[PDB]
Amino acid sequence: MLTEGISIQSYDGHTFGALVGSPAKAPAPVIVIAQEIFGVNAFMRETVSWLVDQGYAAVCPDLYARQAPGTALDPQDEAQREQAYKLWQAFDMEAGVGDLEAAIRYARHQPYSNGKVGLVGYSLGGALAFLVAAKGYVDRAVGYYGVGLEKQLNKVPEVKHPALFHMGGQDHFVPAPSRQLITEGFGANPLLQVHWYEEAGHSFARTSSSGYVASAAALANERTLDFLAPLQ
């Protein structure tokens, strides 16, 4: 779902919608949520309400709007899950970071915003969170099981704002060597932080997933809440 009337525009002219969640009391820091490859779907809504109850405002931009606006896919549905793979395969990460940048500007200026903006990303969004972090567009970013992180190691020296990552130990998407590259690369920057949940795989934090692990999810989400706390 997307909020009716919300329209964010990128430097190149493209405009896209977003599922917005206003805070209970204002002003409050805004958390821009970067999606997985399934668009603004059920988990994205779940995530929106999770953060508003924790005391934040939430903005989940429709990043697939350049390819297919309003797309919201079900990972458990074979057909839909495949559309996701197709859209992900055509996804342009540069524009993704640009739209994210625009959504970040949107958030800092809302009547309820306190000027603080954090960014949380899952899967595809986990890679984007790292990149926005390397660009320095946010106060602090968090990534959940980011894919292709090992391919972005050269940007490690560029991140000058705190960033936290949660990676599952038995994540198929992350081969053992990738783990070594990631851990070794992130470790040097005192502002990056990567935790590995040994008994967890991919999407361990999304309940609909079979990879969901309650203890891993609980710890990960707790660390996320304490890392974001300074923004309030």
* Burial class, 57, CB count within 10 angstroms (exposed 0-12 / middle 13-18 / buried 19+): buried
Active site (catalytic) residues: 171, 202
Give me the CATH number covering residue 223. 3.40.50.1820
Q: What was the experiment behind these coordinates?
A: X-ray
- In total, how many domains does the chain have? 1
Its domain, for residue 163, covers 1-232
- Helix, strand, or coil (residue 58): strand
Q: What is the resolution of this structure in A?
A: 2.5
- Helix, strand, or coil (residue 203): coil
Q: Nearest to residue 27, comparing CAs of 61, 58, 57?
A: 57
Strand ranges inside the chain, DSSP E: 8-9, 15-16, 18-21, 28-34, 57-61, 113-122, 140-144, 163-168, 192-197
Unique residue bearing structure tokens 């959940």? 144
Unique residue bearing structure tokens 């997985």? 36
140-144, strands of its sheet edge to edge:
18-21, 57-61, 28-34, 113-122, 140-144, 163-168, 192-197
Separation between Cα atoms, residue 110 and residue 21, nearest integer Å: 12
